[PDB]
């Protein structure tokens, strides 16, 4: 309600959003008629980039699995031809928010090989997952490394699970159980959690 549009957006000959109307109306128009959902996302982004620059609010752009934007798709036309990521309006509007042509906020992103397309299982570094196009788009950027649990972190995770009574096997509380869990996960958070799920 506080944020108000700055242009007349014409959904259809019968319907338009007038200048100065709250952004919520735009959002509402996307939720009621799905035909205008994709055009409603873009408008939102266009407004959020612009007003943030004026200083009306601070904007955080948090995109998980960002390596999708400059990659490939598995979407096809009716003639069985491939579709490029930039041919999608939703993907094309979200790339504009990764460019650092605005102030009043920060862009935080996380890579992910899980759910990626046309990437080997062991690819995790920025360039391998992003591609030349993605690395060129994000460059300059600050890469932050996430690693496996260190011993303090690993012990704390198992103590949290023990406090929740989530480790039901009688040997899990013991030292030998913790050493075997450490070896079998190698302090990897996801493997450790999956192993503890059925213990």
Ligand X SMILES: Nc1nc2c(ncn2[C@@H]2O[C@H](COP(=O)(O)OP(=O)(O)O)[C@@H](O)[C@H]2O)c(=O)[nH]1
Can you tell me the distance from the alpha carbon of 130 to that of 68, in angstroms, rounded to the nearest whole number? 8
* Residue 186 CB, nearest approach to another protein (Å): 4
- Fill in the per-residue mask, 89 to 128: x = in contact with ligand X (CB under 6 A), - = not in contact: x---x-----------------------------------
- Fill in the per-residue mask, 112 to 151: x = in contact with another protein (CB under 8 A), - = not in contact: ---------xx-----------------------------
DSSP 36-72: GHHHHHHHHHHHHHHHHHHTSS-EEEEEETGGGTTS-
Query: For residue 14, what is the DSSP state?
Result: S
Please identify which residue in 28, 186, 193, 199 interacts with another protein, judged by CB under 8 A.
186
Residue 112: C-alpha distances to residues 97, 125, 191 (Å): 19, 10, 16
- Fill in the per-residue mask, 31 to 60: x = in contact with ligand X (CB under 6 A), - = not in contact: -----x--x--xx--x--------------
Judge contact between 3 and 23, C-beta under 8 A.
yes
Residues that bind another protein (CB under 8 A): 121-122, 179-180, 182-186, 188, 191, 195
């Amino acid at each position: 309600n506080q944020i108000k549009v700055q242009e007349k957006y014409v959904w259809n000959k019968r319907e338009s959003t007038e200048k100065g109307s709250p952004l919520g109306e735009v959002v509402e128009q996307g939720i009621t008629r799905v035909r205008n959902a994709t055009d409603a996302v873009g408008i939102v982004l266009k407004e959020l980039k612009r007003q943030s620059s004026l200083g009306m609010f601070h904007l955080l752009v948090a995109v998980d699995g960002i390596n999708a934007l400059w990659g490939r798709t598995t979407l096809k036309r009716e003639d069985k031809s491939p579709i490029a990521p930039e041919e999608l309006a939703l993907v094309h509007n979200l790339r504009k928010m990764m460019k650092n042509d605005w102030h009043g906020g920060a862009i935080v992103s996380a890579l992910s090989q899980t759910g990626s397309l046309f990437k080997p299982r062991k690819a995790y570094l920025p360039q391998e997952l992003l591609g030349k196009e993605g690395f060129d788009a994000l460059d300059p950027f600050i890469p932050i490394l996430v690693s496996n649990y260190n011993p303090k972190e690993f012990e704390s995770c198992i103590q949290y699970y023990l406090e929740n009574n989530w480790l039901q096997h009688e040997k899990a509380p013991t030292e030998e159980g913790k050493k075997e869990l450490l070896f079998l996960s190698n302090a990897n958070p996801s493997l450790l959690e999956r192993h503890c799920a059925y213990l």
